[model samples]
Target: GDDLTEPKELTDLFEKAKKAVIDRLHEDEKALRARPRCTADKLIFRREYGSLSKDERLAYVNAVKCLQSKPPRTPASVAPGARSRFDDFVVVHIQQTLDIHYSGIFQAWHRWFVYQYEKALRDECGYTGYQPYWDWPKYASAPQDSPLFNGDPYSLGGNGEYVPHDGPVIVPPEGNISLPAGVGGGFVRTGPFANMTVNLGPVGGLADTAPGPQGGLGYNPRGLKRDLGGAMNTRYANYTTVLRLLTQPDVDAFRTVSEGVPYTVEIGPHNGIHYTIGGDPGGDLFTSPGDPAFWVHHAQMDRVWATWQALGLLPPGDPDPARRYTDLGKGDYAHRTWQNSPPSPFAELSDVIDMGYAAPSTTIGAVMSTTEGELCYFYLE
Candidate 1:
């Protein structure tokens, strides 16, 4: 979201955040020389942010508007000529992460990631601006002229809004993709992969979709799983800190983020938007080249992991939310000055303070609201 009228500090803060992110990596994540090889932090953010061309940036927004729905004919889908569409790829990459954690439940982790992203911005680019989230739900209801509808600028949701996707679709090996269940959201059995299921995060700020005893992006932190790893079929394709799965049995895929509301249950994946490469582990899901949500989805997942660290909490399987964390004498999580919004799903502070991204920039308070503070589970008290 671009507002030409943004305060000078906000802009400067973005720069600081970027620089802080890079500095933290160098100081704390020593393994990350300049930038880590696998994290994709350099290629994804540093490179892409600096390399955005008018046409390329425009394409990201246009993709969201144009490629959001319908049969695969979207340009990226057909034009890529690469067999898969953005929607299918990275599905597992996306599904595998944050389901049981703050994200799937649509709670604490939402803001948690933003804080870390800002750190990256600060450390890497010396950016002063905070990482902004895209709240699509409000736009879903906004008229084309509404401010939220300006996908070109890409802003977060100001109102409680959501994007709506009907059901899960499976692509068969024969080169045909179909939604067999016809929209009720049931199991689609294809080949050896049975009990396959996947769920799309309700469009926009999934965090604000609903607020309850344990719902909304501001609620609780869904803890990591107790039984995880390749050993557990339900938790395959993930790590102790993060549990990302493309597909799993209904219950196997997700645990409740907030009890009673079942809103955060993990939906298994068939193939989704993890990467654009066509045969790599998560290659099948990449269909569209124009859509930017694919990137946002991945960014969102990455945020989950980063936020988890910021809280000084353990991964899903950990026991304490307030655990001590460190990479090399550097703190993993930091405390954020807590703020209480007006309770509107879109409630947020007028101006978010910029904390340079060095080391621990994550704040449980900045991300969620709770009597206990940052919603977390796995870690030493």
Candidate 2:
């Protein structure tokens, strides 16, 4: 809302950027090559969460536990509810959710965000492995059977215990259609997260809230709840939908299909997975990060975007109209596409990526390449 600026071709600016990119790319390549790599060649592989061996899975689980024990940070003015080092990430999402979600920055911003969270695990908690994604298609039939939620100590912890609360069908952001409830509800007192406390939200329900560390929502401590909606899996987020979306002709078309608009009864794939994963934390727009699964879900989203980039989807100059936000007929925040600044911790999409000290200052275009910049991982084979 600060002094609205017109979109520009910035022909002169373009020449300057081209030069900056070339110089930076070379410097990065040299520096990156010199550093020891995660794998022998420095190429790290990110596989589906369930695909990890038993010990590997437990390592991830333990890493999350380590983060839990670490202390939180941030000025109380920003995150009234932050209670631990892990909550720093959660607080960022809660504070900036709407601003980033329905904009051009959705995919790119999250790519940077998730990568930083992975670094937090590794740097702060001694997590050596890369982030793992929840390959939704593989576990679509019965998520409970998947190792990511098999209720073993190694698994992310299985589905929540059935504390059935007959709630109304959830109408998504663009309320064109309603969705059925998932098969789960109540406390997920089963796995590594059974005792984990979610300290934010129900913020959606409370607006006239108070001041404090946990936003106005305060320290709303509770166990995880999951719905794992079958309807969402079978229709909205399965392999068929993913395939169709990726094949769309242009960036706008691909994004529209992938993100969805109000005209369609189907919420976009991004929303579908969240809705499918259902429950208090996983489904909450501002609070989803409270659920550990949020990280994996987002890693998969980045995989989709990164793969799409491999196909060279953007038009010339990547255009302003292309970067603008669209709600797909579902009413949410204002669709801001041109030269907009996403909330704190991020700027305009074209600005150099900055989440932590692990990465260099580079454009979003640079970050798009999975093996470039601080990123060096690929989705499942």
Candidate 3:
């Protein structure tokens, strides 16, 4: 196996980082407003991209060394009166170029920002740091309230506030498993598990009347496909459904995170889809594929969803086969604290994260680590 660089022993790095941060905070008083160069991609190269050709794909990626490449600031000089914290190194090193753009042409730029951002810290502050992610789906049941979601512009908690669930709360009928009838179902109205239908798309009467190119924040249900496309067809419908379900009353307010809380959003083209980190329920300006750390945190959340699917919970009989939720986990990252019932041969969540019809018996990421793609394939059973 290729010597995979194990995730840095972040504990030690955080230790020094904490100290460095303290020292840097007091010194770099004037660097807060500094910026980075045009946080934009420098047209390194561009070529046709189509399915079936692996070579062409790699070439396309290599061509754009930094889809948001800016000349590296290389930190030729470390100014004095700067905090010892890694933040200090980052703020000043590329402060002049940091446009803080999060979407559109800025996706790649954000990744670049961290690249140089980390480099500056290493050069000047003698600290090493890696980006972090939010693994939301992991925190089993007691996901009540926390600042982990501080980025959302607005989100509130409800009834069961501040409670922390450690493992998956059977969502019965929730597992990607099929129903005894072999037919698809929606939010079940009875049983240990129930189904809660959501608004499916971001559409409404006002949007239908808007005088925009597409007539409003409109999208094509046909364009929006999911492992369970039949159920979740439109972006607005899909998102609104989940959000509406989440905000519904009596449904474990803690897990829903109804109380005021931070939410995140990211909007732009990625793998060719309109997405935003600010999920339908809440809003928080956040990272993206541009945010390298985004995937890790997302993977962790995927783990949660995987586990949720494994537990075989749903509104008793609901089996529409929850799909289009997060072909990748997009909400808050919840892991590290989730209770571990037992160890399974599941792989990481990033591989085939789209299979919503997963069994409560195993996790995709865990199995993919060894199945060699053949085993990771899932179905709506």
Candidate 4:
């Protein structure tokens, strides 16, 4: 009796947006071809998870599992809780959460981070496919049934079982706003990641206690949990929201809305998706990457940024001349700028994006364009 599907208008809007990007690329073919290392033949395509065939999807899942199986490289002294290569990624994120989020370098930093994860999956695990993104609007009404979370061998895994809860979740760092709960609030009981364990954090996580050493860096093992809130997804991450986000006038406006204003009722798509999959780590502001879903979710976030850049909406100059960001350096593309919330420094292209053990440190300038510098991929249209 329950039936809700993505609307045709949303599909058409996405198509139109993508076409604008492709059209722009075609117009700039000459300049693009001049980039010796970033030629058309070498560009890799990152696709939406549902667009992949079942076998291809399984390949991605196996690669993630491979990372989970391999031993970690992080020193025990640093993050005693890191149990596998996958956990190493979480550790790096945990270490730099405050600086990365609600900051000017948010999108650029995560683009490089996700690229490093994809590289590990391929170079270390021998997976040939590129990173896949969870297209939020496509499954807003029934994310559990989506191939990415359908509890099948090829899917990421099913949601946590339902558990009684109190009122809406109050987001941390302020605790003023709240998100509606979903169907599941207990441990995941099925699919490829069913047996997966979250070993490194509760750092501000929901429905769990923080226990371990080094303030969330110590061992605190538990099964992967989720609350797969379709209600949250439908309300905050729907197509209308995304379309509005895409049409933002400049980098400053885009990043501001993307991360959401502080101490307000706003919950942007990025944070919205996090709460939609509420659970330990999933709901945690500092350690959300502990969940496997974090990778795909961030990939989609990067896709949004890339699409925005491709549409030529990057800031032309400092939106505010009174408080101009210092130009750090330039990459293959134009330099960008954004102001961080009060007390944080404005972001410049030359700022370094250090991923610690997850990947080599690189400047924000180098990662501004996915097809430039060391990055060589584009999202599937």
lDDT of each: 0.25, 0.63, 0.22, 0.75
**Poorest 10 consecutive residues by lDDT, candidate 2:** 1-10
**Taking the tens digit of each residue's C-alpha lDDT, what string does model 3 give over 1-381?**
111111233223323323332333333323543521111121111111122134433322222222223332222243221122321322222232212221111212232333333333334433322222232221111111212222111111111111222211112321322111101111122211112111112222211122212221122121111111111112212222223323333212212331112121211112101122211211111212222223323332222222233222233312432321212222221211111112222222432222111111223333321111212211110
Clashes of 2: 13
What is the C-alpha lDDT profile of model 4 across 245-352, one tens digit per residue? 777766656765666665566777888898877777787767788888998999999888777665552234235421212232222111223223344345677789
Of the two candidates 3 and 4, the one with more favorable TM-score, higher being better, is 4
Query: Which number leads on lDDT?
Result: 4
374, model 4: CA deviation in Å? 1.2
Give the poorly placed runs of model 4, Cα more than 4 Å off. Answer: 1-35, 171-175, 313-342
Highest TM-score against the true fold, candidate: 4
Give lDDT for model 1. 0.25
- In model 1, the number of clashes is 75
Please give the lDDT score for candidate 2: 0.63
Q: Give the lDDT ranking, best first.
A: 4, 2, 1, 3
Instruction: Compose the digit string of candidate 2's lDDT tens values, residues 1-381.
Output: 111111132223323333433443455667777882233245566777877888889989999888877877655556556677777777767766756666655666688888878888899999979899876666666677678877888887777776555532444442434566667765677888875787777556411222223443467666677776556765566666666665554555776767776445656778877776667677677788878888888998887665555433234423532232221222232234321333333234355444322222355554555655567665654
At residue 290, give the lDDT of candidate 1: 18
RMSD of each: 19.8, 10.3, 24.0, 5.0
